[PDB]
């Protein structure tokens with residue numbers, strides 16, 4: 417059964433036909449999580465170094481133009497972010513790169529900031545609910561684009577690399593929340609930064625920084641107090657120290 | 659000449675200028691990641707891919723650090739990467755089958771060279787769902803996507819095996835059974851360049 421031919425015949429994406437305990441770890445993660453902290457900030461005009469301490473995990477979700485088919489950030493803007501100034505010497509990054517030139521310019525970024533790519537996480541979008549919706553292609557595109565990539569980067573010394581959900585409605589720019597589960601399940605540390613998050617993505621265990629946030633509660637010394645001794649090196653996947 | 663053609667050879671040493679120009683190139687290279695018939699990074703870079711096309715598309719399978727090295731070769735050979743196919747690997751019941759995450763997919767960079775005219779861009783989408791056959795066997799769906807993209811044109815596969823030979827394609831690999839060429843222009847240029855049927859340096 418050739419699902420590519422079927423897609424050409426019917427408009428049903430091949431991924432429409434994909435089918436489909438230790439969740440104690442999930443509960444450890446939740447008990448480890450710092451209170452949610454968040455800060456409204458125009459990251460273009462903002463001294464990134466004010467965000468202390470250095471982060472174990474950075475989730476970077478710049479608002480690309482391609483997300484608005486029907487302020488956007490160019491890869492020119494993104495590449496100029498001083499991301500290496502706030503990353504811990506051992507740290508991880510998750511960069512949403514879209515599905516176009518971002519797959520190349522995002523790799524340049526990761527190298528610019530001193531990371532190496534260890535994983536390529538694909539968010540594959542099903543169209544079970546609108547097989548009769550054709551895609552207006554990027555001029556350079558050879559194929560209808562039905563996925564987005566989140567690149568994982570490492571610097572210093574259970575889950576699969578796929579997320580499958582239904583294609584969100586036009587104008588919905590949200591990424592699948594499953595990326596957070598993948599990230600948290602790595603147990604990489606508890607200093608977790610989400611750049612370009614929104615009110616709707618605020619989440620325990622995370623510091624969210626973005627221009628559209630309506631409220632802020634970030635205090636650098638309050639934030640640093642969550643990781644002062646004896647809690648300096650917890651993975652996020654262990655018990656609190658008594 | 660439409661039916662399948664092939665050349666058992668060391669792709670490092672074959673003079674690919676005898677083969678003419680192709681609307682589509684596919685390569686599935688033996689990258690030097692984490693060896694068997696492996697090519698080093700410099701050998702990959704030095705492959706004379708540039709002579710193979712003037713206007714058309716290259717399909718380049720990549721994994722591990724070849725995701726980046728394949729982008730290097732692609733750009734060095736003169737291509738812009740314009741798409742990236744992923745093949746979600748399933749079993750016969752459509753269930754999905756790098757030390758941080760398990761891998762559910764393989765990647766195929768799509769590069770463009772020149773200004774391809776008359777291709778059916780946008781017919782297929784960039785996700786393949788298909789059953790794993792045997793190790794390092796790519797899915798046959800890619801040939802269908804390529805045929806719908808560029809129907810009836812000449813194509814060439816690098817590092818193919820005998821199961822890979824297809825009509826409209828010339829397959830190169832060191833595990834093919836001899837030479838089998840039917841296109842007269844190719845046959846002529848092959849006899850002229852290789853009067854004794856041997857491919858050495």
Ligand SMILES: O=C(NC[C@]1(O)CCCN(c2cc(NCc3ccccc3)ncn2)C1)c1ccc(CN2CC3(CCC3)C2)cc1
Nearest residue numbers: 667668669687688695696719764794795796817831832833
């Ligand atoms: O099996 C493969 N390809 C056939 C070969 O036949 C094998 C032996 C080598 N090979 C040469 C090598 C050559 N020169 C160098 C040389 C020659 C002799 C001694 C040492 C070096 N010339 C001509 N073919 C090619 C192969 C390799 C990697 C993958 C990865 N894929 C999995 C994937 C597919 C889509 C999902 C991506 C798949 C298939």
